[PDB]
Design a protein around this ligand. Structure first.
Ligand SMILES: Cc1cccc(Cl)c1N
Ligand SMILES: [Cl-]
Ligand SMILES: [Cl-]
Length: 162
């Protein structure tokens, strides 16, 4: 298992514009296109990202390209963040995948506000961090997926991804 397969499991793959769990226009492998509710704004963003007139539909290769760029950006985002960087670098490889997953789903922002959890993860207080992580809107809104990520942080293994 690696970050790609893990996220592909958590986000799925769709080739036509769709609304995410929050109701925002998205496409491919969880690539958010816009928070605005104008489908047209979404389509414009799509053409801009892909570089062609898509008309709301892409190919798998295209989706995959977006996914690559998005994984990359997330990691980079982590590394450039001063509150994040240090925690990330203290983790083993599996748990780092769980960190990238959260950033991919919620933005560097959204994460940067899990201060107490971050500290716990940094001190390597696994069970504590897991309980604290669950006390969040994130776990309450997307509990199955949050469960998987939390187990991953808790255990350092891929068991939740089976
Ligand atoms: C989102 C994130 C970035 C870096 C380190 C950690 Cl532990 C987390 N959760
Ligand atoms: Cl792009
Ligand atoms: Cl879920």
């Amino acid at each position: 298992m690696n970050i790609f397969e893990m996220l592909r499991i958590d986000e799925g793959l769709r080739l036509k514009i769709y609304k995410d769990t929050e109701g925002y226009y998205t496409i491919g492998i969880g690539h958010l296109l816009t928070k605005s509710p104008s489908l047209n704004a979404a389509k414009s963003e799509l053409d801009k990202a892909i570089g062609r007139n898509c008309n709301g539909v892409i190919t798998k290769d295209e989706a995959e390209k977006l996914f690559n760029q998005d994984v990359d950006a997330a990691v980079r985002g982590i590394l450039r963040n001063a509150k994040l960087k240090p925690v990330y670098d203290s983790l083993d490889a599996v748990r780092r995948c769980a960190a990238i997953n959260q950033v991919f789903q919620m933005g560097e922002t959204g994460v940067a506000g899990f201060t107490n959890s971050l500290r716990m993860l940094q001190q390597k207080r696994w069970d504590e961090a897991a309980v604290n992580l669950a006390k969040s809107r994130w776990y309450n809104q997307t509990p199955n997926r949050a469960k998987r990520v939390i187990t991953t942080f808790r255990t350092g293994t891929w068991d939740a991804y089976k």
